[PDB]
Design a protein around this ligand. Structure first.
Ligand SMILES: Nc1ncnc2c1ncn2[C@@H]1O[C@H](COP(=O)(O)OP(=O)(O)O)[C@@H](O)[C@H]1O
Ligand SMILES: [Mg+2]
Lengths: 371, 139, 7, 747
């Protein structure tokens, strides 16, 4: 028997079997409904669409994400995503073998309970576990001492880990993510007189951000350079074949992680939260945390973000500390690679919450047995 | 023992004196007891002698007076038959087997002693009537 | 969430 | 208690483990006076008891279950006398034939003797290997379930000789002419050269199980033979301890580096290659490696491997050797490079016919791919090294399987196989001063096999009890499953090894801490040495064996990056190399998991079949013929499991006697007032007097079964009674003759 691993994002869901090295199923965790009157009759069309369906047909649809900021906002949509995951794409009977689920730290307590309840009652999974995303990235990157900057859609967080001990008081969560970069990118795009007003082109803005955006190694000199000449401008075809051309704006969007004042967010950027998370640790371990500083999740994929991170923490690190950034190319998948290897450890097999224990205890078992 | 018995026993003891001093050797004590009708084991003889060591057993000489308590101490049929029936149940015993056991087990005797006692008692097949041999050796 | 934010 | 004058007992002696001592005076409830060759009185002193010796009637009988006291000294003495004083080389311990290596050539295998043994019942004759083979052959004919013969010992012990003669017997009694024996015998030099190794303690150690199926038609003519192999020690290819070597063939090549044929291989001496050099032991004295190569090639040519394929084999092996020398510079913590024009890689690529620019890239990077996209990721120098060594082990294992498939291609025969008889050659149990993963595997295989041997003997001695109506409850089973559950099962010592193979920054230090945390005071067969936090002890069926964890992960790790196999599969220069990889998770599986599966395949093969066992013993380290070193033979008897088998047997009813033979022997004890017309009720009354309790023996329909010891007690009372009767007779004769001599002095 083999466990299922499904890393559940806030825009993208990644699933497969344990001991696989890359997930078999990846699709956007997106649900769509038709917003129009039908003309034809005898078409046999179906009510609502999931994932690559709702990507393909998006111009006909309205698209909703059931997860925002790592909180499952509507269970009645999410259950469709899981039903598509297990039955349609994987071709698996989830009643046969256990499942592992991944979650951002410090999110609402009820989220775990209700996800457990749905797993045991609806899917009848034989055993279940949930793991903090930032832990798995250390399994994936091969380390036992780490500080982890994990960002996707919905959530960013830092979690320090030293030789297999977490440091709960030092967890930093920060609600800034690719969705908030995208919403800001729409407004900055409007400055050049392109206007994107509904979800079906929000899905285009996301792709523009993915291909074209990049992080200035120092912002204001390059801001001046791009104002001074068109050399940094680059262009993109919309679906209709309109070329659109974008300049200083393409670095200006992914910067805002480092200056959340642009979004009107109160907190400091990811560099200052990473530093404060280290400094909340005690001094015996800080020297080792400075070397084991690990990028994870898709929002870290922007070119330059490692160099900008290394420079901007170096300016805060005491100069003897040779701080080092680890940014492997897989890292968009690293959380899943970690859940894959964790679920395959023999030592883990004790750890699962079995249905016997759930029926004995009810959903509150999760807080007790899990992290 | 009465005076007559003591006289006959003393005379017999003196017959075993090969040196003329009126004494026998320890090694003759057994000979005197058996010649006088006792059938002690070697263990009983050594016990009544006090388990002497080799040197005094072979060269220390004792007179009749010291022998007498020993004779007294040593002095104070169906089993014999069953013992012979051990080596049979047609009433015979191989001459080879009796020779082997008497010269190789227990307090081993010489082949010549066994030939001497067995002389004339075995037939042409080499079988001994043990009841007749027993009566002969008990007479 | 339930308070300080849309979720 | 009952130790008395003229008892015999064994002194434990350092020089030759047991020496015979006679009890000089009776025991009473701490010091014994004893009589010895070193002195008529020598004294022996007793811990807060001496092993009592068997009676003279029992010693030297052909079957070590016959004896009444079952001891290391008694077994050793029986085998010693039978071998030395009678030059008899075969003995039975029950089912097990024990063969003591004569190490001198002998006439005992002649055709007159084959005729003498053929058609017999086994229980009639004196033990001989033909008496095993005939019991197999007849059971194969008498019932459908076919038969297998399991030969176990050290390689010196004579497994080759006993297989040779087993096949000779099968062929001759079948009356088959053809070419089947000679090819199997001629196969052995290649199977050694690829499969046989020099361990620290033993030369020509065999590091795999070799299985030969002699196939029979519906008429029980020999059709042909089929070879299989199992349990191959893949890790020896790339790591060896002090004064080991890897497989002989690499040294047979390096010795042959001078020949014009091999000039293209650019070989060196065996100190030149990282895989050969590590042991520090290039030369075995007395071996003519240069000619042993020729003795290999002759066997290849007799089987039918073309000279083209032979040059393919030897060029792949030179490939492996040159691959081993490729050396990685660390570029970073998590990056490496092969240096420019690196000479070993240049030679490897020229031998194998692949693009240097691809091998240099793929040896230093791994491909990650998913249905959407693919990433190339660099790997640490350690990972690159481990992947190179796993590639080398994968090539070698495939080459071995290929040569064994061509051997079968030669030996296979057209006719449909009605049934077959197996001859299994497998290494014996192994233990050394410094003890390591290789022995942990060898001992796991021996535990697995000994569980079968216990099933087998237990089932047969449920049958033999039913045949006599004796209650099964008296026989009780002795189980080694609690050890096999410790080694194989989940959270077992292998499973925690494989789990740390992948756990991040796993190490030999942490692995032992996991062992201690999981088993230390939880499972009574696992123990820790006082002085060390790096080692552990498993109480096997035979022994406590101490294993040391250094290098115990690194030997376990095998993983192969598929893109390197794909590159070698895309080679175009020569034909064989694409042939090796004809047909994933096999690339993921560790050496330990591959071994545990190979052993499951072996056990599923043997469990299909009715086993018969042979054990083979090496009497001395120095190759002296017809000498028997008790210090060596005791270690060999423990290592063959024979002493533990006997120790199990002594728990039940070792000694078994037919009522008529019992009556015949012990009538000397029997009062003719008692003795009936009917033997059986006579014996049943006599014995009830002679033994304290019924439970100490049993009455069957046709046989009496005694526990250990008690037949020597009956011999004691027989000897004491008979000697007392001799005392009475002899004192009567002595007294009568002395009395006569007195009358003779009167006369
Ligand atoms: N190659 C890329 N470059 C820039 N942004 C990306 C890239 N890939 C994904 N993203 C953005 O990051 C988010 C998805 O990242 P992901 O790690 O899958 O989040 P999660 O796994 O939590 O759903 C989306 O906002 C997406 O637009
Ligand atoms: Mg994520």
């Amino acid at each position: 028997t083999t466990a299922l691993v499904c890393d559940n994002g806030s825009g993208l869901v990644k699933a497969g079997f344990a001991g696989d090295d890359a997930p078999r199923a990846v699709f956007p965790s997106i649900v769509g409904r038709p917003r129009h009157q039908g003309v034809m009759v005898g078409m046999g069309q179906k009510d609502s669409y999931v994932g690559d369906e709702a990507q393909s047909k998006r111009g006909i649809l309205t698209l909703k994400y059931p997860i925002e900021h790592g909180i499952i906002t509507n269970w009645d949509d999410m259950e469709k995503i899981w039903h598509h995951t297990f039955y349609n794409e994987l071709r698996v009977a989830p009643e046969e073998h256990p499942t592992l689920l991944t979650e951002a730290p410090l999110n609402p307590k009820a989220n775990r309970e209700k996800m457990t309840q749905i797993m045991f009652e609806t899917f009848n999974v034989p055993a279940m576990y949930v793991a903090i995303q930032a832990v798995l990235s250390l399994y994936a990157s091969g380390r036992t001492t780490g500080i982890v900057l994990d960002s996707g859609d919905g959530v960013t967080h830092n979690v320090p880990i030293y030789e297999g001990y977490a440091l709960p008081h030092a967890i930093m969560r920060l609600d800034l993510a690719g969705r908030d970069l995208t919403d800001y990118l729409m407004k900055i795009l409007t400055e050049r007189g392109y206007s994107f007003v509904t979800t079906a082109e929000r899905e285009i803005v996301r792709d523009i951000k993915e291909k074209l955006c990049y992080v200035a190694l120092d912002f204001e000199n390059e801001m001046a350079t791009a104002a001074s000449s068109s050399s940094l401008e680059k262009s993109y075809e919309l679906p209709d074949g309109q070329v659109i051309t974008i300049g200083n704006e393409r670095f200006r969007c992914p910067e805002t992680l480092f200056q959340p004042s642009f979004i009107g967010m109160e907190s400091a950027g990811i560099h200052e939260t990473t530093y404060n998370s280290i400094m909340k640790c005690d001094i015996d371990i800080r020297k080792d945390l400075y070397a084991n500083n690990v990028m994870s999740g898709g929002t870290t994929m922007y070119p330059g973000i490692a160099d900008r991170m290394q420079k901007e923490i170096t300016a805060l690190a005491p100069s003897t500390m040779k701080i080092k950034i680890i940014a492997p190319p897989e890292r968009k998948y690293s959380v899943w690679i970690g859940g894959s290897i964790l679920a395959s450890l023999s030592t883990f097999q004790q750890m699962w919450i079995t249905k016997q224990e759930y029926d004995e205890a009810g959903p509150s078992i999760v807080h007790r047995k899990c992290f | 023992f009465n005076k007559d018995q003591l006289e006959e026993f003393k005379e017999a003891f003196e017959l075993f004196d090969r040196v003329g001093d009126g004494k026998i050797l320890y090694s003759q004590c057994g000979d005197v007891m058996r010649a006088l009708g006792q059938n002690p084991t070697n263990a009983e003889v050594l016990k009544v002698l006090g388990n002497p060591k080799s040197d005094e057993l072979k060269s220390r000489r004792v007179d009749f007076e010291t022998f007498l308590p020993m004779l007294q101490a040593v002095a104070k049929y169906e089993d014999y038959l069953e013992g012979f029936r051990v080596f049979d149940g047609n009433g015979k015993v191989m001459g080879a087997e009796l020779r082997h056991v008497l010269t190789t087990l227990g307090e081993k005797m010489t082949e010549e002693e066994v030939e001497t006692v067995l002389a004339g008692h075995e037939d042409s097949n080499g079988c001994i009537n043990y009841e007749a041999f027993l009566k002969h050796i008990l007479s | 969430w339930x308070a300080x934010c849309p979720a | 208690e009952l130790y008395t004058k003229y008892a015999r007992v064994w002194i434990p002696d350092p020089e030759e483990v047991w020496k015979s001592a006679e009890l000089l005076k009776d025991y009473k409830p701490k010091v014994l006076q004893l009589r010895l060759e070193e002195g008529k009185d020598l004294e022996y002193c007793l811990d807060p008891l001496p092993p009592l010796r068997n009676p003279d009637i029992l010693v030297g009988e052909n079957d070590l279950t016959a004896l009444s006291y079952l001891h290391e000294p008694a077994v050793l003495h029986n085998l010693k006398v039978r071998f030395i004083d009678s030059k008899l080389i075969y003995t039975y311990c029950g089912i097990v034939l024990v063969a003591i290596n004569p190490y001198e050539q002998l006439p005992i295998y002649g055709e007159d003797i084959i005729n003498a043994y053929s058609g017999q019942n086994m229980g009639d004759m004196d033990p001989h290997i033909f008496a095993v083979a005939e019991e197999a052959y007849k059971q194969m004919a008498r019932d459908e379930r076919n038969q297998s013969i399991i030969v176990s010992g050290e390689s010196g012990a004579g497994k080759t000789v006993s297989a040779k003669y087993a096949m000779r017997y099968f062929a001759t009694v079948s009356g088959s002419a053809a070419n089947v024996e000679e090819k199997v015998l001629a196969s052995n030099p290649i199977m050694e050269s690829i499969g046989n190794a020099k361990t620290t303690r033993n030369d020509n150690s065999s590091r795999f199980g070799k299985y030969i199926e002699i196939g029979f038609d519906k008429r029980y003519r020999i059709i042909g033979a089929n070879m299989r192999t199992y349990l191959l020690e893949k890790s020896r290819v790339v790591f060896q301890a002090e004064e080991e070597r890897n497989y002989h063939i690499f040294y047979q090549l390096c010795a042959s580096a001078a020949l014009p044929e091999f000039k293209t291989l650019r070989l060196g001496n065996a100190n030149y290659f990282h895989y050969t050099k590590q042991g520090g032991s290039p030369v075995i004295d007395g071996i003519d490696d240069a000619k042993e190569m020729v003795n290999t090639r002759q066997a290849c040519t007799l089987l039918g491997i073309s000279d083209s394929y032979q040059m393919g084999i030897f060029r792949i092996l030179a490939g492996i050797l040159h691959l081993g020398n490729v050396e990685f510079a660390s570029r970073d913590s998590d990056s490496c490079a092969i240096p420019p024009k690196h000479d070993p890689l240049t030679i490897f690529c020229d031998l194998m016919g692949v693009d240097y620019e691809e091998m240099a890239h793929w040896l230093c990077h791994r491909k990650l791919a998913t249905a959407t996209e693919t990433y190339i990721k660099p790997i640490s120098k350690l990972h690159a090294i481990n992947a190179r060594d796993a590639l080398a082990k994968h090539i070698y294992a495939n080459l071995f399987n290929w040569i064994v498939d061509h051997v079968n291609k030669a030996l296979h025969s057209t006719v449909k196989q009605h049934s077959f008889i197996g001859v299994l050659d497998i290494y014996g149990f192994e233990t050394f001063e410094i003890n390591s993963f290789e022995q942990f595997c060898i001992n796991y295989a021996n535990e697995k096999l000994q569980q079968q041997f216990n099933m087998h003997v237990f089932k047969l001695e449920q049958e033999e009890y039913m045949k006599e109506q004796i209650p099964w409850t008296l026989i009780d089973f002795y189980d080694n499953q609690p050890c096999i559950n410790l080694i194989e099962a989940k959270m077992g010592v292998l499973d925690l090894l494989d789990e740390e193979c992948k756990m991040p920054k796993g190490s030999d230090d942490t692995w032992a801490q996991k062992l201690y945390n999981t088993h230390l005071n939880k499972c009574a067969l696992f123990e820790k040495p006082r002085l060390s936090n790096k080692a552990f002890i498993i109480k096997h069926f035979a022994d406590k064996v101490e294993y040391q964890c250094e290098g115990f992960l690194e030997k376990n790790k095998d993983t192969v990056y598929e893109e390197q196999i794909k590159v070698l599969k895309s080679s175009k220069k020569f034909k064989l190399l694409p042939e090796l990889f004809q047909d994933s998770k096999e690339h993921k599986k560790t050496v330990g998991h591959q071994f545990r599966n190979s052993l499951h395949l072996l056990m599923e093969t043997l469990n299909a079949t009715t086993p018969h066992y042979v054990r083979c013993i090496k009497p001395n380290d120095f190759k002296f013929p017809f000498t028997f070193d008790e210090k060596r033979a005791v270690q060999q008897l423990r290592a063959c499991g024979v002493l533990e088998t006997i120790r199990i047997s002594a728990a039940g009813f070792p000694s078994r006697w037919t009522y008529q033979e019992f009556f015949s022997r012990y009538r000397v004890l029997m009062k003719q007032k008692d003795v009936l017309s009917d033997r059986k009720q006579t014996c049943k009354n006599v014995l009830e007097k002679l033994i304290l309790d019924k439970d100490k023996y049993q009455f069957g329909k046709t046989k009496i079964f005694f526990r250990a010891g008690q037949v020597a007690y009956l011999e004691k009372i027989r000897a004491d009674k008979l000697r007392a009767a001799c005392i009475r007779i002899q004192k009567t004769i002595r007294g009568w003759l002395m009395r006569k001599k007195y009358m003779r002095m009167r006369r």
